[PDB]
């Protein structure tokens, strides 16, 4: 006897079994019964303070002259204030650049995490290699102020012969695994699920904005991984090339039998 939690949304019921015989196509028809009906003046034309259409004549000027001209993170407005007591004095010594800071001060928390996902750490390795009394604790001058990046006991701990400190830094995972909290059957589950509420606005621009925000294929690509065609064109080439999801940035689910769903199978 299989089961699942209750579903609050509005799917599409199949008509009959004797019609769609072999070659059928599933459609993502999940919509919320809770709706929110907006006109095409507020949701599309000139009600949003971000959409730069006619009538909303401010949103182009305000976008340009607050994100690219009068901005204290554009590289021209950093290059004039980097020479002394001034405000971007410290930027030479943190392991960044002007383009690094300009990309870090405009993207999301998400896209900045994807940019962190393809940066090989090296200041932990300095403590492994450059570890002599004669070597006077060498740090690169363009990475000088990253002190806590440099002296880290974890980097030395991951190298030692006996793992007497690697059995202390992640003992939470060992205690969580040895209690059997991954093989234990999930006792509780939510009693109702629902898709997120969408706007019933009857323009094509609303459907374009919904399928570019609610789905937003850049985050889906950065979350699930690369296409196998991309893996073929990156692994049969003559030279090594990089990938924008360098690995599948989906986190490993901490429950082995039931991952990311609520569906229950009897046993």
């Amino acid at each position: 006897d299989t089961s699942s939690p209750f579903f609050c949304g509005h799917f599409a019921e199949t008509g009959s079994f004797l019609r769609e015989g072999t070659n059928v196509a599933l459609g993502y028809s999940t919509r919320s019964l809770v709706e929110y009906r907006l006109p095409r003046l507020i949701w599309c034309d000139g009600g949003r303070l971000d959409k730069p259409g006619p009538g909303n004549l401010v949103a182009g000027f305000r976008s340009k002259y607050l994100n690219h001209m009068m901005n204290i993170w554009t590289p021209e407005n950093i290059r004039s204030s980097l020479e002394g007591i001034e405000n971007f004095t410290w930027l030479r010594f943190v392991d960044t650049s002007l383009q690094e800071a300009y990309r870090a001060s405009h993207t999301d928390v998400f896209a900045r995490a994807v940019d962190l996902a393809s940066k090989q750490n090296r200041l932990g390795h300095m403590q492994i290699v450059y570890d002599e009394p004669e070597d006077k604790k060498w740090t690169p001058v363009h990475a000088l102020f990253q002190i806590c990046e440099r002296e880290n006991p974890k980097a030395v701990a991951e190298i030692t012969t006996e793992g007497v400190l690697r059995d202390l830094m992640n003992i939470a995972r060992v205690k969580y695994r040895e209690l059997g909290l991954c093989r234990l059957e999930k006792a509780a589950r939510p009693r109702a699920s629902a898709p997120p509420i969408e706007v019933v606005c009857d323009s094509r621009s609303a459907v374009i904005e919904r399928e570019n925000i609610m789905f937003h294929p850049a985050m889906r690509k950065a979350l699930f991984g690369p296409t196998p065609s991309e893996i073929k064109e990156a692994s049969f080439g003559p030279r090594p090339v990089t990938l924008y999801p360098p690995r599948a940035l989906l986190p490993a689910p901490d429950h082995d039998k039931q991952r990311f769903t609520n569906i229950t199978v009897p046993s």
């Binding site: 303070l49 971000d50 959409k51 730069p52 259409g53 006619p54 004549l57 401010v58 949103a59 182009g60 000027f61 305000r62 976008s63 340009k64 002259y65 607050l66 994100n67 009068m70 901005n71 204290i72 993170w73 001060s105 405009h106 993207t107 999301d108 928390v109 998400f110 896209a111 323009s203 094509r204 621009s205 374009i208 925000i213 937003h216 985050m219």
Partner: protein, 66 residues
């Protein structure tokens, strides 16, 4: 450099018969309208727009909690 797609033009309206676009007529004016606008900005809007990314590419704000 701000662009908006208004719709599909009504000369290409009945290409197919049940397409789903917003069929709007061709504008009966100029193609190059030149107008000037005087417009104000408060310095607090400069402070917020230089501190945190606002509005345009801040798509992770749809979570809501933190």
């Amino acid at each position: 450099g701000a662009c908006k797609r208004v719709g599909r033009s009504d000369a290409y309206a009945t290409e197919f018969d049940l397409e789903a676009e917003e069929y709007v007529p061709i504008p009966k004016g100029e193609v190059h309208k030149k107008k000037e606008i005087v417009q104000d900005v408060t310095l607090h809007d400069l402070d917020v727009a230089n501190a945190r990314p606002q509005g345009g590419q801040d798509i992770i704000s749809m979570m809501g909690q933190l």
